[PDB]
Curated annotation (Swiss-Prot), chain A:
Tissue-wise expression: Liver, brain, heart, lymphocytes, fibroblasts, biliary epithelium, pancreas, skeletal muscle, kidney, lung and placenta.
Disease: Tuberous sclerosis 2: An autosomal dominant multi-system disorder that affects especially the brain, kidneys, heart, and skin. It is characterized by hamartomas (benign overgrowths predominantly of a cell or tissue type that occurs normally in the organ) and hamartias (developmental abnormalities of tissue combination). Clinical manifestations include epilepsy, learning difficulties, behavioral problems, and skin lesions. Seizures can be intractable and premature death can occur from a variety of disease-associated causes. Lymphangioleiomyomatosis: Progressive and often fatal lung disease characterized by a diffuse proliferation of abnormal smooth muscle cells in the lungs. It affects almost exclusively young women and can occur as an isolated disorder or in association with tuberous sclerosis complex.
Record's subcellular location: Lysosome membrane; Cytoplasm, Cytosol
Name of the protein in its database record: Tuberin
Role summary: Catalytic component of the TSC-TBC complex, a multiprotein complex that acts as a negative regulator of the canonical mTORC1 complex, an evolutionarily conserved central nutrient sensor that stimulates anabolic reactions and macromolecule biosynthesis to promote cellular biomass generation and growth. Within the TSC-TBC complex, TSC2 acts as a GTPase-activating protein (GAP) for the small GTPase RHEB, a direct activator of the protein kinase activity of mTORC1.
Domain of life: Eukaryota
Post-translational modification: Phosphorylation by AMPK activates it and leads to negative regulation of the mTORC1 complex.
Coverage span on the entire protein: 473 to 613 of 1807
Positions bearing Phosphoserine: S68
Organism field: Homo sapiens (Human)
This protein's encoding gene: TSC2
Subunit note: Component of the TSC-TBC complex (also named Rhebulator complex), composed of 2 molecules of TSC1, 2 molecules of TSC2 and 1 molecule of TBC1D7. Probably forms a complex composed of chaperones HSP90 and HSP70, co-chaperones STIP1/HOP, CDC37, PPP5C, PTGES3/p23, TSC1 and client protein TSC2. Probably forms a complex composed of chaperones HSP90 and HSP70, co-chaperones CDC37, PPP5C, TSC1 and client protein TSC2, CDK4, AKT, RAF1 and NR3C1; this complex does not contain co-chaperones STIP1/HOP and PTGES3/p23.
From Swiss-Prot, chains B, C:
Gene: TSC1
Medical condition linked: Tuberous sclerosis 1: An autosomal dominant multi-system disorder that affects especially the brain, kidneys, heart, and skin. It is characterized by hamartomas (benign overgrowths predominantly of a cell or tissue type that occurs normally in the organ) and hamartias (developmental abnormalities of tissue combination). Clinical manifestations include epilepsy, learning difficulties, behavioral problems, and skin lesions. Seizures can be intractable and premature death can occur from a variety of disease-associated causes.
The protein's role, per its UniProt record: Non-catalytic component of the TSC-TBC complex, a multiprotein complex that acts as a negative regulator of the canonical mTORC1 complex, an evolutionarily conserved central nutrient sensor that stimulates anabolic reactions and macromolecule biosynthesis to promote cellular biomass generation and growth. The TSC-TBC complex acts as a GTPase-activating protein (GAP) for the small GTPase RHEB, a direct activator of the protein kinase activity of mTORC1.
Membrane-crossing segments per the record: none
Protein name: Hamartin
Residues of the full protein shown: 746 to 776 of 1164
Amino acid sequence: LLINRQFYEEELINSVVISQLSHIPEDKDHQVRKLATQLLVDLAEGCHTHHFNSLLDIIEKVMARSLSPPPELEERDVAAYSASLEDVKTAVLGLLVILQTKLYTLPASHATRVYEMLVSHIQLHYKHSYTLPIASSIRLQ
Amino acid sequence: DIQMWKVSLQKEQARYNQLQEQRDTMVTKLH
Amino acid sequence: DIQMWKVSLQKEQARYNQLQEQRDTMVTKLH
């Protein structure tokens, strides 16, 4: 209900990332993008030096995958496969947002490094010469 | 006089709703 | 049970007036 950051955020971020450590293994795209957005918004105001948990989880998200392994997923998986990949595209969007917020801040390094994550994630993005329109949209933003 | 106990419980719940809403107003004011 | 009902009345009143002050000191902290 409140902005409980002063009174709760310290123990919260820790206990909640500990409980959500099952983010990557469980592969149900919905809660994936959900926790993505949740960490992004909780880092929009995350000045309790806890960009560690959030951005580390985010990096764990981004290296999930970016291109369809099965060469037979003609609208078969790429529908749900892209429902899964849009979790990380939304994560990327939130990185853009939080970096806009942290344009000037003390742990701006975080931004930079996840920014680097971005370009490295973008590097591998153009590495395989992707054939996904959703990946192309990600490139766009 | 069980209905007195009824109205007691009801007015208590109402008092606590007012407590909650005023707490939330103070929350957004602090924000 | 009617006098026992009065007892229940005053018990509820006491408990709710008790938590009332907890809510009001929360208010005062925010003040």
